[PDB]
Every structure is written in C-alpha cells, then in structure tokens.
Design a protein around this ligand. Structure first.
Ligand SMILES: CCCCCCCCCCCCCCCCCC(=O)O[C@H](COC(=O)CCCCCCCCCCCCCCC)COP(=O)(O)OCC[N+](C)(C)C
Ligand SMILES: CCCCCCCCCCCCCCCCCC(=O)O[C@H](COC(=O)CCCCCCCCCCCCCCC)COP(=O)(O)OCC[N+](C)(C)C
Ligand SMILES: [Fe+3]
Ligand SMILES: [Fe+3]
Lengths: 258, 258
C-alpha cells in the first residue's frame, strides 16, 4: 500500500548530500534572513495541512522526473501524470464517446483518431488508451463532488489493428487550485496559476513499455507559460474543424518494448 | 500570530527560481526514478503528519540561515536555535541554580561563570542570559510530559557589571527523535542521529543586538560529526574539575549594537 524503491544507502547518501547542499547554497547566495526562514517553515506546514504535496510536487518537480525517464525511451514523448489519474476507469469499445453530463454536451466536440504502433510502425493487438481530462469549468471527476465518478474518464479498448476513434469535449485552459499554500506561493512572486488546454493519456500493449503523456492544442493560451513546465513542441495537436462544427484530429502512439 | 517577512515579489521570484532549479538539477544529475519520486512524495506527507517540519528544518537547513546572519556580526559566535526554545522562562538572580528534579541532582554539577560585555569589553547593565538544555536522558521540558514545565530553563538577570554564576547539570550527548520520517531518512542513508553535549543560550542587553548560540565541551563525542552541522571551534568549552568534583568554566558574551 505504501510506495517503495530500491535505492541503496550509498545512492540516497549521494542524492541527499547534493540536494541539501544546493538548498543551503541558495540560502547563502541570497542572504536568506531569519524572518524569511520562519515564513518558509510555516509555509511547509500549511502545504501538508492543506493536502497539497501532490499538487505542489507535480507542478514544480515532476517535469524533471519525466525528463529523466525520457532519455531511455524512443517512442511517443511522455509528459507528467499530474495528481488526477485514477486506475480501472470503465472500458469502452475502440470507437466510443467518453461519459459526460448534459452540460458537457454543450461544448464543441473533439474527435480523436489514431493507431497504437511499435517502434517499426506495426499496429498492436491488445492495446489500451486510458484517457482523462478536465471539464469546461476546469474540474476533474473524483476531485469535485458534484460530478459523476467517471466524467471524462475511460479505458479505451483498441481494435485488432491498434486503432481507436474517441469523441469527447474540446479541452479548455484552467487554473490550478489557488486558495491554499500553492496559490499563495505563486501570488507572492507575481506568477500565474494557468495550465494550457490538454488531454491526459496512459497507453499500453502486451509486452510493451507503457507511456504516460499529455496532448495540447495549437495556438492555445498558456502553452508557452505553463505553470507546470510540462508542454513539449512534439505534443501540440492541430485539430481541423468540420462542417458539422466538430474538431477533428489524428494522432498515433508509438511504444517501446518492455 | 503567523510569521511574516518583507520579501518583495521580485526577491522571492529569484530565490524560488534558483531553489527549484537546483532541486531539478539534482534529479537530472542522479537520474532519480519514478519509484524514487513516489517514495519522496509519501515521505514529505509523513513529515507533516508527524509534526516534524521544525525538527527536519532545524537539523538540515538552519545552520545556513545562521551562517548568513553571522556575516553581519562581530560579537560572540551564534549557532542555531533548534526547536526547543521557550519564551518568558522564570527570572533568576545573577548567581543561581536552574530548576531541576532530584534525579537531575545526581548528575555532576556544572558551574558557568562570565560577563556580558559590548564590543569594547565594557560590562553591561540590564543584560539577561536565557538558558535551556537537555537532561541526562536527552529530554527537554515542555517536550516531554513527565518533566516540570521549566526543568533546566531560566532567564538569568545579570548584575550591574553584567556578571553571572549559573550552576546546572553537565550536559550529555543525545539522539534526535528517530521513530518518525526524520529517523527513517537518516537510517535509509546509513547516517547517525547524535548531537554533541551542549548548552542553548539567548543573551540580551538594553539597545544591544541579541545573540542566539550554543556551547559545547572539549573532547566530547559527536562534536566532529553533529547531525545538525551546528558546532563551531570558537564555541567549545574546557571545564576544569574541582576538588568538590564539580565542573567549572568561565565564558564571556560579547554583543553587537542594535
Ligand atoms: C527543505 C525541503 C527539503 C527538500 C528535500 C531534501 C532531501 C531530499 C531527500 C529525501 C528523501 C527521503 C526518503 C527516505 C525514506 C526512507 C524510508 C522509506 O519509507 O522508503 C522505503 C523504501 O526503501 C527505500 O528505498 C529507502 C528510501 C530510498 C528512496 C529515496 C529516493 C528518493 C530520492 C528523491 C530525492 C529527489 C529530490 C531532489 C519505504 O518503506 P516504507
Ligand atoms: C520539494 C521541496 C520544496 C523545497 C522548497 C522550494 C521552494 C522554496 C520557496 C518557498 C517559499 C514560500 C513562501 C511563500 C509564502 C507567501 C505567503 C505568506 O504566507 O507570507 C506572508 C508574508 O509576506 C511575504 O513575505 C510573502 C512571502 C515572502 C517570504 C518568502 C521568503 C522565504 C524564502 C525561503 C527560501 C529558502 C529555501 C532555500 C505571511 O502572510 P500570512
Ligand atoms: Fe490536467
Ligand atoms: Fe539541543
């Protein structure tokens, strides 16, 4: 139930030494003061009392952890998970619409097509696409009590050829939660709390290395100034609008061997 | 009631940028992994749930905050406060014994003499010495329910000449609390959790800059390997034993103008 790793005492000793040394160096570089130290201590306590460690770490730290993993991989680019992924979302056939409310129906549709392939571009049987994203108000299901537990969440079962056609709503930018210690941190430095419009996805196939990633939208606000530093040029979509007024886009996933 | 500072949005923006950048650089230098990231997130949450932010920060971070303050000062060396200082401890006359239990009486006495002076060595009227320290079991009053609220704590009123003669018990090394996330951190890297034997003191006088500091004992265990990195050569005492079997030492305090 609790996370574990095999990091030797020696490896942790070297990590800790550098990380503590770097922080101490910043204190010495900027002449950090005792009143500043006191504010910083109270702020660390407020983050914990506020349930905001997942939030703060995934905004400010996760992008480097993904950058490390990215060195080992040759397939589709990864991006950060973020704190809103939920396992075992209900399966949907390869052409489907995600579960949504009447209000969600009022949003311009997005029709997302593509194929899960291996590094050589051959289509993969047994592949699954797990999709989750925010509604037009910037809310995620299971992290807003008013929403049905699986709003805009599903496990898409790709066909024999690894193909999928998933219709949903067109994502919109949103602000991360700003009524706690993280919004305070951002407001005290004259920052902004916005992420660009995006889809979240986890893509898998028998005997393949899974990929966690995000997909963004050409010309969208906040792509060049994401608070989470999680956007990459290779992950920006360019949907074309239909005569039915729906947004259409094709995007393929490419998986490394396990 | 809550700590405050005047740090401009610009100054905080520069501090944050460096501090976040340094941490991200460590992740990239050591190839920190996703399971390592998950352990680190759970550990930050455990520190907060455990009431251990004062502990962890004062062991691993405070010594740099004091090193900053030390640049501005010419008097007696400072050291870290640590998390156990309590304000308004009961006043005692210039020659006194600290409050203690019968058990404490069984410990070799320590008789601490000296004078509070200005930078030119002139003795100061109105000077106070606030002393607090651990008992022979490594416990601090108000942070162990079995002890009287002011065990080994007092506000010493120096004489007209700034002089004092304070008798107490001879301090002993102790381990910091190790049954929580901080002891876990230390145990996973093959570290040790010991501080050397020490007195804690805050010394003041009308219109003077106060000094927070610690005093240590020549040849004592753990002086060269303090977990808190808080010892300095200039703060090591060399008590001489009497024919009464008590330890005797003289030490002067030297205060900067406010
Ligand atoms: C002031 C803010 C401080 C900033 C942080 C600086 C220090 C960073 C180092 C903290 C890592 C502490 C993790 C130790 C937990 C060990 C016990 C444990 O629960 O892990 C065990 C798992 O066994 C282990 O692997 C021992 C811990 C090693 C894992 C540590 C790797 C994490 C490194 C992350 C550092 C990146 C930050 C830059 C779970 O059993 P429950
Ligand atoms: C992964 C572990 C993360 C490690 C930490 C890295 C980030 C470090 C920066 C965190 C400082 C956050 C303090 C912001 C709080 C602002 C609002 C606030 O309460 O302060 C206000 C006081 O008004 C202010 O001064 C605004 C905050 C500025 C003070 C920030 C100085 C602290 C810098 C310490 C960084 C040293 C760490 C290296 C109190 O009102 P309540
Ligand atoms: Fe998101
Ligand atoms: Fe102490």
């Amino acid at each position: 139930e609790r996370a574990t790793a095999d990091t030797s005492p020696e490896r942790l000793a070297a990590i800790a030494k550098d990380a503590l040394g770097a922080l101490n160096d910043v204190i010495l570089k900027h002449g950090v003061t005792y009143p500043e130290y006191r504010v910083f201590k109270q702020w660390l306590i407020d983050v914990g009392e506020g349930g905001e460690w997942p939030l703060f770490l995934d905004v400010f730290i996760e992008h480097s952890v993904e950058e490390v993993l990215a060195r080992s991989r040759k397939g589709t680019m990864g991006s950060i998970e973020g704190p809103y992924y939920i396992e075992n979302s209900p399966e949907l056939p390869s052409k489907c619409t995600l579960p949504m409310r009447e209000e969600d129906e009022k949003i311009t549709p997005l029709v997302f097509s593509g194929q899960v392939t291996d590094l050589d571009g051959n289509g993969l049987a047994g592949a699954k696409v797990e999709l989750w994203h925010a509604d037009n108000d910037g809310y995620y299901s299971q992290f807003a009590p008013h929403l049905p537990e699986w709003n805009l969440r599903g496990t898409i079962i790709a066909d024999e050829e690894g193909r999928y056609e998933i219709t949903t709503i067109q994502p919109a930018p949103y602000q991360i939660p700003t009524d706690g210690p993280t919004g305070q941190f951002i407001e005290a430095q004259n920052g902004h709390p916005w992420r660009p419009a995006h889809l979240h996805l986890i893509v898998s196939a028998p005997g393949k290395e899974s990929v966690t990633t995000q997909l963004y939208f050409k010309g969208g606000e906040w792509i060049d100034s994401d608070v989470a530093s999680a956007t990459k040029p290779e992950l920006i979509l360019d949907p074309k609008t239909g005569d039915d007024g729906k947004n259409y886009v094709t995007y393929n996933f490419v998986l490394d061997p396990a």
